[PDB]
Amino acid sequence: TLSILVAHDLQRVIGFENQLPWHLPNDLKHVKKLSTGHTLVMGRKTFESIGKPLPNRRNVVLTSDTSFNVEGVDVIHSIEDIYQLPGHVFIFGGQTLFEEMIDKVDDMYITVIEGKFRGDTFFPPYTFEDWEVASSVEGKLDEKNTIPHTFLHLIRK
Amino acid sequence: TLSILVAHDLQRVIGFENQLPWHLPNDLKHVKKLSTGHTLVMGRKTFESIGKPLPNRRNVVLTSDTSFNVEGVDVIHSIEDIYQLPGHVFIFGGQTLFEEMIDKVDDMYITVIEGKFRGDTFFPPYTFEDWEVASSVEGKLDEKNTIPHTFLHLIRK
Ligand SMILES: NC(=O)C1=CN([C@@H]2O[C@H](COP(=O)(O)OP(=O)(O)OC[C@H]3O[C@@H](n4cnc5c(N)ncnc54)[C@H](OP(=O)(O)O)[C@@H]3O)[C@@H](O)[C@H]2O)C=CC1
Ligand SMILES: NC(=O)C1=CN([C@@H]2O[C@H](COP(=O)(O)OP(=O)(O)OC[C@H]3O[C@@H](n4cnc5c(N)ncnc54)[C@H](OP(=O)(O)O)[C@@H]3O)[C@@H](O)[C@H]2O)C=CC1
Ligand SMILES: COc1cc(C(C)(C)C#Cc2c(C)nc(N)nc2N)cc(OC)c1OC
Ligand SMILES: COc1cc(C(C)(C)C#Cc2c(C)nc(N)nc2N)cc(OC)c1OC
């Protein structure tokens, strides 16, 4: 199983200046709930934004930088390597990895952030022609989660 | 001057179940700055959501209820009475007063909430064909103000 895991806004913004344009705890919970005990594949710039690997899962970083060495983090150097990773693998970002993998994944877990933010990185366009809505769940709002959001699970037709 | 004063979302939602669907401190300050020392005109249901008049300005409530009696609150019974109120009058809501007044105001101060919220009351459709953008200012996001928003001042051509 190859899955995309992404949060994007109404215009498909996923980031600004190497950061998330919003903070939504319930979505971090959704990421944790889904990828804990599985595998995350991510591009080099996305990793730098985190700095430390995420606990209780395999962290895999894609980069051409051949001297790349961070502890608790596995390194790969081409897209072809991704298919040799075992288990549920989540394409975790960022923009360039999402662009390379959208045509290859079996399904997508997309959190639609129901708002318009300033961004400089984007999730690629996609149409509901190619994607079956397996589920759509409206995010619950409270004092920590103030932007409306929708959990979509999309499966390639 | 007869002005509209409103906060609406990307689908022109202004309320849900007689409350605001969001909380935006910077927009409350925008209301304070703009209306203090002038007049707010509002519908009965909008008033009942507040309960007490707002400080440092004339509060006028529109209702057909001839028994309506609240201290600090002026009462009118026809739309025609709005035109005999002196100074800068802000049409303050809600949906029904906005519907009655949109074709009559000189201008509108609209805070666009750049998100999609669940609502049951709406600001009427308007086109930028009939309205000049006097100013458009991006709201500043901090820890207390988490939803993107834009302050619009629109003037009838
Ligand atoms: N909202 C969301 O769901 C998420 C948002 N983001 C956001 O995305 C932005 C970062 O995205 P972006 O700038 O595109 O960068 P990426 O995170 O996708 O990193 C790009 C890097 O990945 C490496 N790489 C990509 N493809 C290959 C390949 N085929 N072979 C070898 N190496 C490859 C290269 O590294 P190198 O140059 O070292 O060789 C490249 O510079 C940030 O703003 C971040 O916040 C990220 C994930 C999720
Ligand atoms: N986001 C925003 O900028 C704002 C949002 N709101 C929201 O709007 C919603 C309320 O809107 P809505 O339900 O339409 O109610 P309104 O506040 O507009 O009031 C409706 C009532 O106003 C009185 N009224 C209106 N027109 C007349 C008239 N021509 N003659 C006599 N009386 C009149 C009537 O009261 P009566 O029945 O007693 O005669 C009518 O029932 C709330 O959810 C509130 O949160 C409100 C203001 C701003
Ligand atoms: C999972 O937590 C983080 C996610 C992220 C990124 C931005 C890389 C992500 C993501 C992501 C989110 C938040 N939601 C969904 N649905 N998918 C994603 N890939 C960065 C972090 O550092 C700031 C994180 O915490 C340390
Ligand atoms: C401005 O104060 C309030 C406004 C309001 C309403 C919702 C009536 C309003 C409004 C309004 C806002 C928030 N922004 C803009 N730009 N215009 C408005 N008319 C309700 C309140 O309590 C329930 C308020 O606090 C006392």
CSV table of C-alpha atoms and ligand atoms in Angstrom, one decimal, chain A residues 4-9 12-22 27 31 41-50 61-66 68 76-82 91-100 109-111 113 120-123, ligand 1:
chain,number,residue,atom,x,y,z
A,4,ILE,CA,-0.4,10.1,0.0
A,5,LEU,CA,-0.8,11.9,3.3
A,6,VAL,CA,-1.4,15.7,3.0
A,7,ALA,CA,-3.1,18.7,4.4
A,8,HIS,CA,-4.1,21.4,1.8
A,9,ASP,CA,-6.3,24.5,1.7
A,12,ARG,CA,-4.2,23.5,-2.6
A,13,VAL,CA,-1.6,25.5,-0.6
A,14,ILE,CA,0.5,23.2,1.6
A,15,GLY,CA,3.1,25.6,2.8
A,16,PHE,CA,4.7,29.0,3.1
A,17,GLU,CA,8.5,29.6,3.6
A,18,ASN,CA,9.1,26.0,4.6
A,19,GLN,CA,6.4,26.0,7.2
A,20,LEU,CA,2.6,25.1,7.6
A,21,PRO,CA,0.4,28.2,7.1
A,22,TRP,CA,-1.9,26.9,9.9
A,27,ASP,CA,-5.0,16.9,12.0
A,31,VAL,CA,-1.4,12.0,11.0
A,41,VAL,CA,8.6,9.1,2.9
A,42,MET,CA,9.5,12.7,2.6
A,43,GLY,CA,11.7,15.1,0.6
A,44,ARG,CA,14.8,16.7,2.1
A,45,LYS,CA,13.3,20.2,2.7
A,46,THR,CA,10.3,18.8,4.5
A,47,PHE,CA,12.6,17.0,6.9
A,48,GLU,CA,14.7,20.1,7.6
A,49,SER,CA,11.5,21.8,8.7
A,50,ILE,CA,11.0,19.1,11.3
A,61,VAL,CA,14.1,10.9,3.5
A,62,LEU,CA,14.5,11.2,-0.3
A,63,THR,CA,17.6,13.3,-1.3
A,64,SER,CA,20.4,13.4,-3.9
A,65,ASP,CA,22.7,14.6,-1.1
A,66,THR,CA,24.9,11.5,-0.9
A,68,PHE,CA,23.1,12.9,4.2
A,76,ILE,CA,17.0,7.0,-0.2
A,77,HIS,CA,18.2,8.6,-3.5
A,78,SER,CA,15.6,7.8,-6.1
A,79,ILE,CA,11.9,7.3,-6.5
A,80,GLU,CA,12.5,3.7,-7.6
A,81,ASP,CA,13.7,2.9,-4.0
A,82,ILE,CA,10.2,3.8,-2.6
A,91,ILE,CA,4.1,9.8,0.9
A,92,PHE,CA,4.3,12.6,3.5
A,93,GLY,CA,5.5,15.5,1.2
A,94,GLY,CA,6.5,18.0,0.3
A,95,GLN,CA,5.5,19.7,-2.9
A,96,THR,CA,8.0,18.0,-5.2
A,97,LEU,CA,7.4,14.5,-3.8
A,98,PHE,CA,3.6,15.0,-4.0
A,99,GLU,CA,4.2,16.0,-7.7
A,100,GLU,CA,6.2,12.8,-8.4
A,109,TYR,CA,-5.6,10.8,2.8
A,110,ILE,CA,-6.2,14.5,2.3
A,111,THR,CA,-7.2,17.0,5.0
A,113,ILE,CA,-8.3,23.0,5.2
A,120,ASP,CA,4.4,29.3,-1.9
A,121,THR,CA,4.1,25.5,-2.2
A,122,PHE,CA,1.1,23.5,-3.5
A,123,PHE,CA,-0.5,20.1,-3.8
C,1,LIG,N1,0.6,20.6,4.3
C,1,LIG,C1,1.2,19.4,4.2
C,1,LIG,O1,0.5,18.2,4.1
C,1,LIG,C2,2.7,19.3,4.0
C,1,LIG,C3,3.4,20.5,3.7
C,1,LIG,N2,4.7,20.4,3.4
C,1,LIG,C4,5.4,21.7,3.0
C,1,LIG,O2,6.0,21.6,1.7
C,1,LIG,C5,7.1,22.5,1.6
C,1,LIG,C6,8.3,21.7,1.2
C,1,LIG,O3,8.1,21.1,-0.1
C,1,LIG,P1,9.2,21.3,-1.2
C,1,LIG,O4,9.8,22.6,-1.1
C,1,LIG,O5,8.7,20.8,-2.5
C,1,LIG,O6,10.4,20.2,-0.8
C,1,LIG,P2,10.4,18.7,-0.5
C,1,LIG,O7,10.1,18.5,0.9
C,1,LIG,O8,9.5,17.9,-1.4
C,1,LIG,O9,11.9,18.3,-0.8
C,1,LIG,C7,12.4,18.4,-2.1
C,1,LIG,C8,13.8,17.6,-2.1
C,1,LIG,O10,13.6,16.2,-2.1
C,1,LIG,C9,14.6,15.6,-2.9
C,1,LIG,N3,14.1,14.9,-4.0
C,1,LIG,C10,12.8,15.0,-4.5
C,1,LIG,N4,12.7,14.2,-5.6
C,1,LIG,C11,13.8,13.5,-5.7
C,1,LIG,C12,14.2,12.5,-6.6
C,1,LIG,N5,13.4,12.0,-7.5
C,1,LIG,N6,15.5,11.9,-6.5
C,1,LIG,C13,16.4,12.3,-5.5
C,1,LIG,N7,16.0,13.4,-4.6
C,1,LIG,C14,14.7,13.9,-4.7
C,1,LIG,C15,15.5,16.8,-3.3
C,1,LIG,O11,16.5,16.9,-2.3
C,1,LIG,P3,18.0,17.3,-2.4
C,1,LIG,O12,18.0,18.7,-3.0
C,1,LIG,O13,18.6,17.4,-1.1
C,1,LIG,O14,18.6,16.3,-3.4
C,1,LIG,C16,14.6,18.0,-3.3
C,1,LIG,O15,15.3,19.2,-3.1
C,1,LIG,C17,7.3,23.1,3.0
C,1,LIG,O16,6.8,24.4,3.0
C,1,LIG,C18,6.5,22.2,3.9
C,1,LIG,O17,5.9,22.9,5.0
C,1,LIG,C19,5.4,19.2,3.4
C,1,LIG,C20,4.7,18.0,3.7
C,1,LIG,C21,3.3,18.1,4.0
